[PDB]
Copies of this chain bind each other. A is one copy, B any other.
Amino acid sequence: MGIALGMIETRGLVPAIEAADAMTKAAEVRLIGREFVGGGYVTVLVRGETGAVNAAVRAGADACERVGDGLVAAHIIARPHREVEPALGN
């Protein structure tokens, strides 16, 4: 039911899955996607309520700073436009 996006950029899939597992061990969110951007760039996209998303991304950032090539970015869009849902794949 959550609409807020919590999502992580990582160079390397190791910090990507570590971030995703931090997402699911931090707060009640479901990952809507795992995307291979290219050149080691990988994102994890999770949906949920604003507080749960914020806590999850907090844990993911605190976990992925040093793993592999390292964390690239964390961002917490909380209310995407109705047209942005197709951009995340639905």
User: Which residues of A approach B to under 8 Å, CB–CB?
Assistant: 2-5, 7-9, 11-15, 17-18, 20-21, 23-31, 33-44, 48-56, 58-59, 67-69, 72-84, 86-88
In addition to A24-B84, A34-B86, 13 A-B residue pairs with Cβ atoms within 8 Å of each other are A7-B13, A11-B41, A21-B84, A27-B50, A28-B49, A39-B41, A49-B52, A51-B51, A51-B52, A51-B78, A54-B54, A56-B78, A68-B72
A40 touches B43 (CB 8 A): no
In Å, the complex CA distance between A88 and B50 comes to 24
Q: Which residues of B contact A9 (CB under 8 A)?
A: 12-14, 68
A8 touches B17 (CB 8 A): no
